[PDB]
Amino acid sequence: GLXRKXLCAXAKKKXKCKXAXKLXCKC
């Protein structure tokens, strides 16, 4: 859920970190 946190999960995640809530724009 949530556009910016879509964009983040988009750039921060193909070929990129594991499935945790607060970890969103890191993984």
The conformation of residue 13, written as its DSSP 8-state character, comes to: S
DSSP conformation class of 26: T
**Quick one: DSSP state of residue 9?**
H
| Residue reference for tokens 């910016």 | 4
Residue 15 CA to residue 1 CA, distance in Å, equals 21
**Running DSSP on this structure, what letter comes out for residue 10?**
H
CA distance 1 to 21: 11
CA 18, CA 11: separation in Å to the nearest integer? 14
Q: Encoding tokens for residue 25?
A: 């724009």
End-to-end C-alpha distance for the chain, whole angstroms: 15
Answer for the pair 12, 25: CB distance below 8 angstroms, yes or no. yes
Coil vs helix vs strand at 4: helix
Say which residues have a Cβ less than 8 Å from residue 4's Cβ, sequence separation at least 6: 25
Say if CB 18 and CB 27 are below 8 A apart: yes
